[PDB]
Paper text:
[name] excises uracil from uracil-containing DNA to concurrently form a covalent bond with the resulting AP-DNA. Structurally, [name] is highly similar to family-4 UDGs (F4-UDGs). However, [name] is unique in possessing a flexible R-loop (105KRRIH109). Our earlier studies allowed us to propose a reaction mechanism of [name], which involves the formation of a covalent bond between H109 of [name] with the C1′ position of the target deoxyribose sugar concurrently with the uracil excision from this site in DNA.
Residue numbers in the entry: 2 to 207
Amino acid sequence: AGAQDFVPHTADLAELAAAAGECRGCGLYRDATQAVFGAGGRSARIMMIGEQPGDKEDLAGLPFVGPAGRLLDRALEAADIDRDALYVTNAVKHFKFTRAAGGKRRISKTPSRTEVVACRPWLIAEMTSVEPDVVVLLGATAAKALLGNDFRVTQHRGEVLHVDDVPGDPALVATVHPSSLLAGPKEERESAFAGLVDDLRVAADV
Ligand SMILES: O=c1cc[nH]c(=O)[nH]1
Ligand code: SF4
């Protein structure tokens, strides 16, 4: 079901990414510019999964290149993690969006659980390909994709999780989505940034 028949029998990331360009596993390929596959290499020990490409990513062809990605880079650097050593992807690989009159960007819309489950074959192929030691799940959509639709990121901060139906049984660490840290009162943003750095250090210490 979903994307499964579009996923080739290969662990080569370049070939998986090409095949995802042709996926019709849900409706999101229609209005998006292109599939945005994960970035990084199969030697990566840490895999990080966001929700979906946003406006900038949909046109760059790469994940986490916009304001959320810049905040994530600042957190990674503070956690002493090299972004180039990670494998970074998203639960959903085509941008789901709308525009508002007078808006300065295309606005992301939340993928339905249906779309997440349809796209998950790709995440499974990425995980099988990369064999990460730990998966960082950035925000609610990504965390629920592997931990269940009832899972609450806010209730499990700092925790190393392991679930039985995840390929290779990597450690899993669920944390706040970097987009959440972009706005809000300064003290709240600074406390939340420190907690993201903490969670990234937990994952890197696995
Ligand atoms: O790649 C991206 C960029 C922004 N937000 C995400 O969840 N992923
Ligand atoms: S979002 Fe995922 S399942 Fe849906 S068409 Fe795109 S790659 Fe396929």
